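Training component of the fellowship. As part of building independent skills, the fellow (R.M.) carried out the full modelling exercise for a liganded target. The chosen ligand was iron/sulfur cluster. The inputs are recorded below so that the supervisory panel can assess the work.
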Amino acid sequence: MDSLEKIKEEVISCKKCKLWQFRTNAVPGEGYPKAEIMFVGEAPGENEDKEGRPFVGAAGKLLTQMIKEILGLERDQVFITNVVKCRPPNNRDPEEDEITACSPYLDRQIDIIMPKIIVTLGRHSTKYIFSKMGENFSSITKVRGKSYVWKYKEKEIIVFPTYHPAAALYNPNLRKILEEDFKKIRELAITP
Ligand code: SF4
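Fellow's submitted model of the complex:
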């Protein structure tokens, strides 16, 4: 039967799409298997590729700070991954065939974890999860900052799209919006 350990083993040696040829390390994701909050980013950047870990660049440091200061959580208490788990060449966006190849890993991670909340960081992860939900995706600007109920198996999962933290690094206005969004995520997390 499936497990997060099995998914990690498969990802680390995966050659299911052409992205494998460009990587230093695949990035399977990390965190608590019973996380109430699951964060899903786009694809690994350069530092993520180097470390084999999600959100470790400057952007990841900001994410960590927001999780700590606004949500009141350590990274070990949440689960963090990416819709595509290898760094696209020259940091381009992932192709549709790459998302198709890799996203079953994310499906399997969600299946196992069944978080209360999935926070989709950026337009690619948001569009992907919306496609799985059957929810209409317009743009990240139009859908961010709202909760969407995803009836999934026996449970309800709250999907909360926001901007990717890298977008907030050098943009004070967008960072305040991201912070406000994390405040809303906090309220959702603590409310029965
Ligand atoms: S991006 Fe995903 S599907 Fe493609 S090689 Fe890496 S782990 Fe496999």
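The panel noted the following from the submitted structure. Residues 11, 14-17, 19-20, 26, 84-86, 98, 101-102 surround iron/sulfur cluster (CB under 6 Å). Residues 1-192 form a domain with the Uracil-DNA Glycosylase, subunit E fold (CATH 3.40.470.10).
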